[PDB]
Design a protein around this nucleic acid. Structure first.
Ligand SMILES: CCNC[C@H]1O[C@@H](n2c(NCCCCNC(=O)CCCC[C@@H]3SC[C@@H]4NC(=O)N[C@@H]43)nc3c(N)ncnc32)[C@H](O)[C@@H]1O
Ligand SMILES: [K+]
Length: 391
DNA sequence: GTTCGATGTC
DNA sequence: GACATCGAAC
C-alpha cells in the first residue's frame, strides 16, 4: 500500500491502551509498523497471513499463518486495519482467485453478505466486523465498487445495521493497478453514514466532508449535489418509462445454429459496445467475430425484432445512447423497451441522454467507482416531458 | 435471465 | 491514455 495511503488510514485509527490491534493479510506488517510508530507500543499487535513466504513481522508482533476468512481467534479485536486482497473467486480462465470448490463453499457458509460472484474484499470486510469488539474500529482500503453495485447490497445493509460508517474517496491511488479506491472507517457502535472527499498534497491526504446520511440503511452511496437533486426531480426516472433488458450473452450466440464465424450473404454482424456511438450505430463493422441472419435474432431475444433505444454499459461512467432503427442482434448493452402507455420522441430523447448535462450528472454522482453505467444508475436518469411521457 | 472486473489490450 | 471487456458466475 502506498505510504501516504497508510499514513492517512493510521490517522483515522484509534485503540484503547492495551487494545488488540490486528492487520489481516499482513505480509511484513506495514500497517502494524505505522500504527506503532504513530501511537506507541502499549498495544497487543497481531498480524494474520496465509503465505509462509510472506509473513515477516517484527518480534513485537504475533504472526499467525491462516486463511483470514476461516480463522477463528480466541478473542475479539479493538482495531483492525489494512489492505484486504481484491478479487472474484472463480475459474482461472476468467477470474483471479483460485480455490477448491470446497473452500468456496466454506466462504459462502461463513459470510451472510456473500452475493452473486462476490469478492474477497467484501468477505474480508464482513469477517473484520465480526471480529471487532463492541465499539471496535476497522479502517480498510478497498475498491469503490461496493458503494454502487448489486453484488454488495447485503454488505451495505450489514454495515448500516452493525455500526457507523465513514467512507473517504481516494480514487486511482495504486500505481499500475486499475482500481478506484476508498477508505472505510467503521465503528461497531452508533449508526449512520458519512461521505468524505479527499485532497492529496505532499503532506498526505486531507479529508473534506461531503455529506451525511444519519439514517443510512444500506442504500447506494453517491456524491449528490444541489444540482443532481434539482435534475432528478425535474423529470420521470428512465426506469419508470422503459423496461430495461440486457443483451443476450456471448455463449448463447456462439452455440446458436444460425450464428456463423464468417461473413456471408443474408448475414449481419452481431454488434458489441464498439458498434455503439453517441447518436448512431455502426452496422457494418464486426467486433464480435459473429454473424447471423438479422431475422433469426428474435430467437435469442424477442426484442431484437423491434427498433428500440440502446444504452452503453462499458464506456466508463457516462451515458451513450442510440436508436437502433434497423433492429439488429446485439451481444452487449442495455435494451430499453417503452412500458404500456409511454409516449416517446426517440430523436430528442437520444439527444438528451448524450447531452453534456447528462454526462456531468453521472460523473458527479458516481465518479469513477466502476468502469460502467450500471442498471441502477441508468434507471434513475431523469427524463422531462418533451422527450418521454408516461400518460 | 444479467452481473463484474488489484480489468485487458491497444 | 482509448476504449472497451465477455464469459463464469448465480
Ligand atoms: C493488499 C495486498 N495483500 C497481500 C497479501 O495478502 C495475502 N492474502 C491473500 N491474497 C490473495 N489471501 C489471503 C487470505 N484469505 N488470508 C490472509 N492473507 C491473504 C497474501 O498472502 C499477500 O501477502
Ligand atoms: K493480494
Amino acid at each position: 500500500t502506498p505510504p501516504e495511503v497508510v499514513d492517512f488510514m493510521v490517522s483515522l485509527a484509534e485503540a484503547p491502551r492495551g487494545g488488540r490491534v490486528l492487520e489481516p493479510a499482513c505480509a511484513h506488517g506495514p500497517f502494524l509498523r505505522a500504527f506503532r510508530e504513530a501511537h506507541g507500543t502499549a498495544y497487543r499487535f497481531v498480524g494474520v497471513e496465509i503465505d509462509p513466504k510472506a509473513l515477516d513481522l517484527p518480534p513485537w508482533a504475533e504472526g499467525i499463518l491462516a486463511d483470514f476468512l476461516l480463522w477463528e481467534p480466541g478473542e475479539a479485536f479493538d482495531l483492525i486495519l489494512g489492505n484486504p486482497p481484491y478479487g472474484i473467486v472463480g475459474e482461472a480462465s476468467k477470474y483471479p482467485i483460485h480455490v477448491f470448490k470446497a473452500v468456496k463453499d466454506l466462504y459462502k457458509k461463513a459470510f451472510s453478505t456473500w452475493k452473486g460472484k462476490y469478492n474477497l474484499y467484501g468477505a474480508f470486510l464482513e469477517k473484520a466486523v465480526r471480529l471487532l469488539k463492541p465499539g471496535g474500529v476497522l479502517v480498510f482500503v478497498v475498491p469503490a465498487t461496493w458503494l454502487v453495485l448489486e453484488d454488495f447490497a447485503l454488505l451495505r445493509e450489514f454495515l448500516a445495521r452493525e455500526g457507523k460508517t465513514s467512507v473517504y474517496y481516494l480514487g486511482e491511488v495504486f500505481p499500475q493497478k486499475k482500481v478506484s479506491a476508498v477508505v472505510i472507517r467503521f465503528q461497531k457502535s452508533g449508526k449512520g453514514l458519512s461521505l468524505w472527499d479527499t485532497q492529496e498534497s505532499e503532506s498526505g491526504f486531507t479529508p473534506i466532508l461531503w455529506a451525511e446520511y444519519p439514517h443510512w440503511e444500506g442504500e447506494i452511496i453517491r456524491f449528490e449535489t444541489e444540482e443532481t437533486r434539482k435534475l432528478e426531480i425535474s423529470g420521470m426516472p428512465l426506469g419508470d418509462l422503459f423496461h430495461i433488458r440486457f443483451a443476450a450473452r456471448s455463449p448463447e450466440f456462439k452455440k446458436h445454429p444460425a450464428v456463423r464465424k464468417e461473413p456471408g450473404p443474408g448475414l449481419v454482424p452481431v454488434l458489441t459496445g464498439r458498434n455503439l456511438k453517441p447518436g448512431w450505430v455502426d452496422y457494418e463493422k464486426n467486433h464480435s467475430g459473429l454473424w447471423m441472419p438479422k431475422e433469426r435474432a428474435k430467437e435469442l431475444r424477442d426484442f431484437y425484432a423491434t427498433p428500440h433505444l440502446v444504452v452503453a454499459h462499458t464506456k466508463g461512467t457516462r451515458v451513450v445512447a442510440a436508436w437502433d432503427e434497423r433492429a439488429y442482434p446485439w451481444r452487449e448493452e442495455f435494451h430499453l423497451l417503452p412500458k404500456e402507455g409511454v409516449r416517446l420522441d426517440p430523436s430528442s430523447l437520444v439527444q438528451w441522454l448524450n447531452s453534456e448535462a447528462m454526462q456531468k450528472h453521472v460523473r458527479t454522482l458516481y465518479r469513477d467507482f466502476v468502469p460502467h453505467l450500471t442498471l441502477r444508475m441508468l434507471e434513475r436518469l431523469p427524463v422531462r416531458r418533451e422527450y418521454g411521457f408516461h400518460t
